[PDB]
Ligand binder design. Structure first.
Ligand SMILES: NC(=O)C1=CN([C@@H]2O[C@H](COP(=O)(O)OP(=O)(O)OC[C@H]3O[C@@H](n4cnc5c(N)ncnc54)[C@H](OP(=O)(O)O)[C@@H]3O)[C@@H](O)[C@H]2O)C=CC1
Ligand SMILES: CC1(C)N=C(N)N=C(N)N1c1ccc(Cl)cc1
Ligand SMILES: [Co+2]
Length: 159
């Protein structure tokens, strides 16, 4: 099982300037619960976005994708191809935009948080992948985050 998990603005933006232009504690907790205990695969730029004092993310096999053969990610595995990372029963690809595009053919689940923030797409933004018509989606109700933004969870599946 390879799943993708991301939070997006309604427009599809997931990242800007190498970081994320929101933070919903409830989404962070949802992310932690879904990934805990499993492999998490991230692109090198997403690894770089984590402060050194919080990485590796605890309780998970942290894997970082890079073309740099000597890139060191203390507390993680660095691999040069996505396929090397998919050896555990449950693997979560946790971003960013480039890595979702590479991982989509291997994926059968997407856990998507939609953040009700009006954020038009800009050059250089990281975006959510486009899910075609092979994917079945299930939508939750809109909820209010303590951060002031509404959000809702989608669970997409395919065989
Ligand atoms: N809202 C959300 O849910 C999420 C948001 N984000 C945001 O997304 C942005 C980062 O996403 P993005 O900029 O797309 O970068 P990624 O996190 O996708 O990392 C890109 C890097 O991955 C490596 N890589 C890419 N393609 C390949 C390949 N074919 N083979 C080997 N290595 C490869 C390269 O590393 P190298 O350069 O070392 O070769 C490349 O620089 C940030 O803004 C981050 O905050 C991140 C995760 C989820
Ligand atoms: C916390 C956040 C934004 N939330 C969701 N739904 N999915 C992710 N992949 N996230 C994420 C987790 C870790 C990192 Cl480093 C970047 C984004
Ligand atoms: Co689990």
């Amino acid at each position: 099982m390879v799943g993708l998990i991301w939070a997006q603005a309604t427009s599809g933006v997931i990242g800007r300037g190498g970081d994320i232009p929101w933070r919903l504690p409830e989404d962070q907790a949802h992310f932690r619960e879904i990934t805990m205990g499993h492999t998490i695969v991230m692109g090198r730029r997403t690894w770089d976005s984590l402060p050194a004092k919080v990485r590796p993310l605890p309780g998970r096999r942290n894997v970082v994708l890079s073309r740099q053969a000597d890139f060191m990610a203390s507390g993680a595995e660095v691999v040069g191809s996505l396929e090397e990372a998919l050896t555990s029963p449950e693997t979560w690809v946790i971003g960013g935009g480039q890595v979702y595009a590479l991982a989509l053919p291997y994926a059968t689940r997407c856990e998507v948080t939609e953040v009700d923030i009006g954020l038009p797409r800009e050059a250089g933004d990281a975006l959510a992948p486009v899910l075609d018509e092979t994917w079945r989606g299930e939508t939750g109700e809109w909820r209010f985050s303590r951060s002031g933004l509404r959000y809702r969870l989608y669970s997409y599946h395919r065989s």
